[PDB]
């Protein structure tokens, strides 16, 4: 709800 791409997966 705060930083959507902060985990393992970042779209690229």
């Amino acid at each position, epitope marked *: *709800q*705060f*930083r959507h791409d*902060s985990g393992y997966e970042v779209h690229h």
Partner: antibody
């Protein structure tokens, strides 16, 4: 389907502690942050803190340092929040949420602090 | 901490009319990677919150395109092109650019009929 199943309603005597759980399924538990959010009766939302189960990393709202402790059991894909030394200010609904490109939410756990 | 100020704090909107909520930040929400972590949530009474918009303007899947978000730096807006009965509840802006993460105070959307 992604599901976050939170533990049931709690009754906690003043000064005692409670540990509530958030059982995750439907995704790779180690790969996403779990956030915890507080909603006191009738008030807005507050951020407590978060844990990244893959490595146990945590970040906290300083307001809840020494009140909330976040852990995660990787084997059972369950996140936990322990709340210590409860007062009436801790009576609230607590939500867990899985951060991501889609966010998923637990159903909330109501905690009542009362004798 | 980042203070998020929402205006107005309550809305009363007739079905079919548009609505707009302002969210203003006390700090830039631009992050080092070029993204701006200003998101919008809705919570109905009886329900858990749900995210509607992320990074200013991206629409969550399943959320009607009646909802749009805009803004940059410190001024942000959530817009509803035409309100429907099921849009009632409390709308929050929330930020994840700076720790600790913070929420606006919430804007209650009531339907006028």
């Amino acid at each position: 389907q992604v599901q976050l199943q939170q533990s049931g309603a709690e009754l906690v005597r003043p000064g005692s502690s409670v540990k509530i759980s958030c059982k995750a399924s439907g995704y790779i538990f180690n790969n996403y942050w779990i956030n915890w959010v507080k909603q006191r009766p009738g008030q807005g939302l507050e951020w407590i803190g978060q844990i990244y189960p893959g490595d146990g990393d945590t970040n906290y709202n300083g307001k809840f340092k020494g009140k909330a402790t976040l852990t995660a059991d990787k084997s059972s894909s369950t996140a936990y929040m322990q709340l210590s030394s409860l007062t009436s200010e801790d009576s609230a609904v607590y939500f867990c949420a899985r951060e991501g490109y889609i966010v998923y939410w637990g159903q909330g756990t109501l905690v009542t602090v009362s004798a | 901490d980042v203070v998020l100020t929402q205006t107005p704090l309550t809305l009363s909107v007739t079905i079919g009319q548009p609505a707009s909520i302002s969210c203003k930040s006390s700090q830039s929400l631009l992050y080092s990677n070029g993204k701006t972590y200003l998101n919008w949530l809705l919570q109905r009474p009886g329900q858990s919150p749900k995210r509607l918009i992320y990074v200013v303007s991206k629409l969550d899947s399943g959320v009607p395109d009646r909802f749009t978000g805009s803004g940059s730096g410190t001024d942000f807006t959530l817009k509803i092109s035409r309100v429907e009965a099921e849009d009632l509840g409390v709308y929050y802006c929330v930020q994840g650019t700076h720790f600790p993460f913070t929420f606006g105070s919430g804007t209650k959307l009531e339907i006028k009929r």
